[PDB]
Amino acid sequence: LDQILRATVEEVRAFLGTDRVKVYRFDPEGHGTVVAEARGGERLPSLLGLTFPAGDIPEEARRLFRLAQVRVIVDVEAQSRSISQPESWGLSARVPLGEPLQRPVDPCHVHYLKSMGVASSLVVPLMHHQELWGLLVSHHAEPRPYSQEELQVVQLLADQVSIAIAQAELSL
Numbered sequence: 001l002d003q004i005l006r007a008t009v010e011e012v013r014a015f016l017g018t019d020r021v022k023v024y025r026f027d028p029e030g031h032g033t034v035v036a037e038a039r040g041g042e043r044l045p046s047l048l049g050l051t052f053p054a055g056d057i058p059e060e061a062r063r064l065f066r067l068a069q070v071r072v073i074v075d076v077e078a079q080s081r082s083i084s085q086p087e088s089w090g091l092s093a094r095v096p097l098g099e100p101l102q103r104p105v106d107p108c109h110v111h112y113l114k115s116m117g118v119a120s121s122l123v124v125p126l127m128h129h130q131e132l133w134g135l136l137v138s139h140h141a142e143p144r145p146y147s148q149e150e151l152q153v154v155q156l157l158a159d160q161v162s163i164a165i166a167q168a169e170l171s172l
């Protein structure tokens with residue numbers, strides 16, 4: 001899979017022409033690693049082989065990817081801020097998403113991206129069945145809204161990729 005996932009990121013970037021796009025594999029201990037990444041004009045350094053700390057994503061946000069499978073970051077210019085709430089109570093996957101066309105990320109995450117030279121990035125999850133295997137994400141150094149039609153291409157492409165993770169898994 002590590003090999004296939006590598007080629008998958010090469011085709012993805014092409015379709016989305018995104019400067020940088022990487023695949024994120026989720027481990028059972030919460031830790032994840034980068035097994036796929038592509039850079040345009042060496043503009044963005046390589047992070048391949050680097051391990052990211054799960055602490056980067058508590059759990060509430062991670063659930064949304066498995067519950068509603070929908071999350072995107074708007075132009076850091078719009079300064080969108082996110083925060084926790086006492087109401088909590090997450091919504092099941094049985095009921096409709098009922099979420100805004102956009103998702104704000106707390107300031108602590110805003111800078112994290114800014115420090116990465118990212119302004120607007122789309123986060124498409126890679127899952128199979130009821131479990132989550134990994135997470136996909138595209139980085140754009142410029143504002144660019146998404147369309148329902150174009151959204152499917154990528155949103156679907158990811159689903160087609162997540163499916164590869166499942167079928168290929170049987171191999172190993």
Ligand SMILES: *[C@@H](C)[C@H]1/C(=C/c2[nH]c(/C=C3N=C(/C=C4\NC(=O)C(CC)=C4C)C(C)=C\3CCC(=O)O)c(CCC(=O)O)c2C)NC(=O)[C@@H]1C
Nearest residue numbers: 022024052055056057061071082105106108109112123137
């Ligand atoms: C600050 C106090 C906390 C923190 C920030 C933080 N990050 C998220 C969520 C995400 N962060 C990323 C980052 C990445 N993009 C990549 O390309 C990669 C490697 C391939 C990473 C790791 C992503 C994709 C997410 C998920 C999207 C989302 O916004 O949920 C959060 C959660 C958001 C929230 O607060 O609701 C936070 C807080 N990092 C820390 O260590 C602190 C805990």
